[PDB]
Amino acid sequence: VESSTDGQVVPQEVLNLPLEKAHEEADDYLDHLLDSLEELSEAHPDCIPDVELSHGVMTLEIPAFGTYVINKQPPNKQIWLASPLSGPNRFDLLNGEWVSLRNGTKLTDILTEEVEKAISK
Amino acid sequence: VESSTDGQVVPQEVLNLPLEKAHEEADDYLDHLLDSLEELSEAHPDCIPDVELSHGVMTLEIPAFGTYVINKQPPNKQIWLASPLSGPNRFDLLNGEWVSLRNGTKLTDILTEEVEKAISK
Amino acid sequence: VESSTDGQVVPQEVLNLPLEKAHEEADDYLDHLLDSLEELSEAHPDCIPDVELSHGVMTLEIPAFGTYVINKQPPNKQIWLASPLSGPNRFDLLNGEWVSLRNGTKLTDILTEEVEKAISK
Predict the structure, then answer these.
(1) Could you say which of B54, B55, B67 has the minimum Cβ distance to residue A11?
(2) Number of other CB atoms surrounding residue C111 within 10 Å
(3) Dihedral (C-alpha) B19, B21, B27, B32: value to the nearest 10 degrees?
(4) Impact of mutating residue 80 to A (chains A, B, C)?
(5) Cβ distance of B67 and A13 shorter than 8 Å
(6) What domains does chain A contain, in order, with CATH numbers?
(7) Is C67 on the interface with B (CB under 8 A)?
(8) Residues in chain C closer than 8 A to B25 (CB atoms)
(9) How far apart are CA A96 and CA A106, in angstroms?
(10) Whole-angstrom Cα distance, residue C15 to residue B26?
(11) SS3 label, residue A8
C-alpha cells in the first residue's frame, strides 16, 4: 500500500458491524449440491454409491457411467464439470444461475438429466 | 519464458509507438464515480458527509443509512458493492456497463436510486 | 490442504482413465488463428508479411495499417486486441464465441473485416 497515505476511512460503522467475508458463489453451489446429491444417494436402487467433497473438488461415483469430477477453477470462466457421459464443461453466473460458456445451458439441468437418466436403470 | 526462443517480434512500430498499459475497467469506473459522487457531496442538505477512495476501495458515508463500501475484486465476477440498504452485490461488464451477476441490474442504477432516495430526506 | 483429511477419492477410474489437462479456451483460439492467418499470409499481394506467436502473445504485421498485438490476459475479461485501426478491445466467451465486453461484437468478425479490408488495397 505505497501511497504514503495516513489513514483512509476506519469509518467504524463499517468495522463495528457484524462483519463477514463473502463466500465464493461457486463454494455456495457445491454445498447446495453436496447434500442435495447425498439426499439422492438414498434412493439409489444401488447405483450411485458415493459423493465426496475435498477442498472445492467434488467426486460423484455413478458405476453405470463412470465417475464425475466437479471443480472450483480460476476464471476465464469458473466451476468445472468432467462428465463420464456428456464430456467436459465450464460455467459462469448469468442471472443467478450457473451457465455453460460453450452454449449457455444450465449445469443444474445437466446434472438433473444425467442423475435421473440413472435412477431409471 | 522457457522455449529457447531467440527473439520473437520487436517489430518496433509497436514498441516505437506512444505506448501505454490499459487501465482496469473497474479502475476507470471508480474514478468516474469518485468525482461524480463528490460533485453530489455538494448538494447534501447535510447527509452525505464523505467519500474516500484508497487503493481500489471506496467508502461512502451516508448517515441516513450507514456506510457503503465499493471494491476492486478478483473475478468469479469483479467490482464489489456492500450497501447498508440493499445488501451485497457483484458486477461484471456486459455491454460496456456494470451489471449484477445475481439478476443483471446496473449498479450505476442501484447507486442512483439509493443516493437520490437520500436527497429526499 | 490443511483439513487433516486422510484420503478423499482416488476412485481410480478417474485416475486410471486416459487423463488430460484442459487447454485454455483462449489458447485454443490463438492456434486456430495462427494457422488460419498464416494460410491467409499466402495470398497477400505483398501486404501481410508476418504473423508470429510467442507465449500467448501474437503479433501480426500489416504494413498498410501498422502492427496488431493479440494477447492472453488475466480476467476482468480475457483475450486482448490491440488494433492499429480499430483500437484496443477485450473479449470473453458468450456462447462458444469470443465477444467484446464493450459492445459484444465478435473479434472473429473484427479480424475478418480488417484483414480483408487489406486484401483490397
Answers:
(1) B67
(2) 20
(3) 0
(4) Impairs cell growth, lowers aconitase activity and strongly decreases interaction with ISU1
(5) yes
(6) 20-121 (3.30.920.10)
(7) yes
(8) 76-77, 101
(9) 11
(10) 41
(11) coil
C-alpha cell at A103: 452454449
Instruction: For residue A119, give Cα distances in angstroms to A53, A62, A112.
Output: 22, 10, 11
Please give, rounded to a whole number of angstroms, the shortest distance from the CA of B59 to a CA of chain C.
22
Q: Taking the CA of residue B49 as centre, how many other CA atoms within 13 Å lie in the half-sphere pointing to its CB? A: 8
The single residue listed with the C-alpha cell 478423499 is C8
C-alpha to C-alpha distance for A121 and A27, rounded to whole angstroms: 31
DSSP bridge pairs for C75: none
Q: Are strands B57-62 and B66-71 parallel, antiparallel or unpaired?
A: antiparallel
Centroid of chain to Cα B102: 17
The experimental method behind these coordinates is X-ray
CB-based contact C8 A54, cutoff 8 Å: yes
Q: How far is C7 from chain B (nearest CA, A)?
A: 28
H-run or E-run covering A36? helix A25-37
Reading the block at residue C94, the C-alpha cell is 458468450
DSSP C57: E
Resolution (A): 3.0
Those residues with Cβ within 8 angstroms of residue A96's Cβ, 6 or more apart along the chain or in another chain: B101, B102, B103
Q: A75: which chain B residues are within 8 Å (Cβ-Cβ)? A: 75-76
